[PDB]
Amino acid sequence: ASRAKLATNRPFEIVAGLPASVELPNYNSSLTHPQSIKNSGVLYDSLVSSRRTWVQGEMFELYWRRPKKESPTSGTIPLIRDKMQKMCDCVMSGGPHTFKVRLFILKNDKIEQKWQDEQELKKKEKELKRPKRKRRKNAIKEDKDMQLTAFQQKYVQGAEIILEYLEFTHSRYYLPKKSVVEFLEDTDEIIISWIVIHNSKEIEKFKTKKIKAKLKADQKLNKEDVSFNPLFEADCPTPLYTPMTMKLSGIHKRFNQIIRNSVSPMEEVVKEMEKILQIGTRLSGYNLWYQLDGYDDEALSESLRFELNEWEHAMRSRRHKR
Amino acid sequence: APATGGVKKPHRYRPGTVALREIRRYQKSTELLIRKLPFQRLVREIAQDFKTDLRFQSSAVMALQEASEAYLVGLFEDTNLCAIHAKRVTIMPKDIQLARRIRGERA
Amino acid sequence: PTGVFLANGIRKKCLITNKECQYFDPRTGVPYSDVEAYKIIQRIQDPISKEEDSDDQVRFKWFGFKNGGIYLDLSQRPAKGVPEGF
Amino acid sequence: LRDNIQGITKPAIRRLARRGGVKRISGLIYEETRGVLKVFLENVIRDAVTYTEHAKRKTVTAMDVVYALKRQGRTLYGFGG
């Protein structure tokens, strides 16, 4: 935000701190002394920003962050480790960028209790009704790869999935329940799509206000003698919204069932999305001007250069901390 | 057709900056800053404690408010200089006490 | 800044793939790990892919997000089931 | 009338100190400020009331206030002097 306030009438606007315009840049018409992309680095800045944002953005709801340091808070690390189960390593693409992930399950205790009750019922039903062969080891391996081991047999449906970045293990995010999931059997690729609202906090707070108003009205009526959906409500503020889509690759057959079971009934979210699409304000698509004039944009160029220098200076320490 | 203007963000003025804005704004203004009615309540109570069945001129109460504000601003600026000398921006009661002593109201 | 190495001699990590950078683009100054990385960057450049179904070609656009921006391909086929107007 | 020492509020002390140009304030300041104001008012009011009672009087006039302040050495102009 503290970036230099661009001089009036520049042929670009500063979007996310960088020079961009809605229309495709016409350098040849607009620039007399264009600095090279090497000189500008705008492309570099954009790429670093993109990757970092993908590491830290709002795409998935955050749920756990490593606490910024005989404090017992150390003892909670193994507890948080055990509250999730450990699962195998998978690749993700974010726009032009790609990332890698290991998978972790969030232990739904109701599924554990119901599994114990189901085993009780099945046992009671059964009681009421009443060298070594390596090929068998290969069969067991394949069965455990496409059928389910005990932890997978309990967590088939309603299991909870946590995402973590293998290049940034500090943050954990929820897999979107309000998402469309397609499992490509031929390519082993999974595409996830969801709509995201930039002022969602505004909508949630107005939703809370409406809930309070309805509760007050019900209390007033009671003094004499609910699937509240903010997106349906006529007084909901305009969502600034974006539709998003992402592809996963590298997930194995057994995990697909867990994932496929985990997401919400499709028609309901489809109708919700259609409402969002009527009421939403779509994010406008714009084009970055990677080339800047060395004379009119000298301040902007140097500012970008300085910020890049600081970013790189910090980035070395990140691995030096490992 | 309408540009989004990017994504807006909650603007958070750095702490103390709008405080300086208030400093300047209130310093330019010249009206009485203490609410008239509660100050009248204080002076009525103090006089009633001191003497029974008193009355006031409205102008007298206004003059008392003006004099109070003048004294208080003088005290506050003295306290500011004291705190500055301490090399602290947070004024503390001891700064006022020191101001009083150097003034001699409690020496 | 130029080159693929840090001041301590450790190789830079690709912004696109997170692989260790092998080569450096002299024109733009963006170091890249692999041919795929370079090709992706070039496709980010050359917005009008002058082949002259043309609209179906990968078209990366930049979207501004809270505190940063990301590149999105408007030709990305969204997951099966997206409504009309998605 | 009760608790009117509180009636000054914090925000009034805030605004007055703002006139004084103080950039940073402490919570304890308010109580001390109230005490100082209390003793100042008590002295000024006692002087004014005795100035009034001399004249076989019942209404404290602006003359009594201004001359009481003059006796405290605090000189005030603009109220009919």
Describe this structure in words.
Chain C: Belongs to the VPS72/YL1 family. Chain C: This is Vacuolar protein sorting-associated protein 72. Chain C: Participates in the catalytic exchange of histone H2A for the H2A variant HTZ1, an euchromatin-specific factor, leading to chromatin remodeling and changes in transcription of targeted genes. Indirectly involved in vacuolar protein sorting. Chain C: It is found in: Nucleus. Chain C: Belongs to the SWR1 complex at least composed of ACT1, ARP4, RVB1, RVB2, ARP6, YAF9, VPS71, VPS72, SWC3, SWC4, SWC5, SWR1 and HTZ1. Interacts with HTZ1. With 322 residues, chain A is α+β, with helices and mostly antiparallel strands. Chain A contains eleven helices and twelve strands. In chain A, strand 4 and strand 5 (97-106) form a beta hairpin. Chain A is globular, with a radius of gyration of 26 Å. Chain B is mainly alpha-helical and 107 residues long. Chain B has helices at residues 17-28, 36-50, 58-86, 93-103, and one strand spanning 55-56. With 86 residues, chain C is α+β, with helices and mostly antiparallel strands. Chain C has one helix at 35-44; strands at 23-24, 31-32, 60-65, 68-73. Chain D is mostly helical and 81 residues long. Chain D has one domain (2-80): Orthogonal Bundle (Histone, subunit A). Chain D has four helices and one strand. In chain D, helix 3 (29-54) packs across helix 4. The interface between A and C is large, with 59 and 47 residues. Strand 1 of chain B pairs parallel with strand 1 of chain D.
Question: Secondary-structure map with pairings?
Answer:
The structure is cut from a larger assembly and holds chains A (322 residues), B (107 residues), C (86 residues) and D (81 residues).
Chain A (H helix, E strand, L loop, with lengths): L12 E3 L2 E4 L5 H4 L6 H4 L1 H15 L4 E5 L10 H8 E11 L2 E10 L2 H21 L4 H13 L3 H5 L5 E6 L2 E7 L5 E5 L4 E9 L2 H25 L15 E10 L3 H10 L3 H14 L1 E2 L4 E2 L9 H23 L2
Chain C lengths: L22 E2 L6 E2 L2 H10 L15 E6 L2 E6 L13
Antiparallel strand pairs in C: 1-2, 3-4
Chain D lengths: L3 H4 L1 H11 L9 H26 L4 E2 L1 H10 L10
Helix pairs in contact in D: 3-4
PDB class: gene regulation
Keywords: Chromatin Remodeler, Snf2 family ATPase, histone exchange, H2A.Z, gene regulation
Entry title: Cryo-EM structure of native SWR1 bound to nucleosome (composite structure)
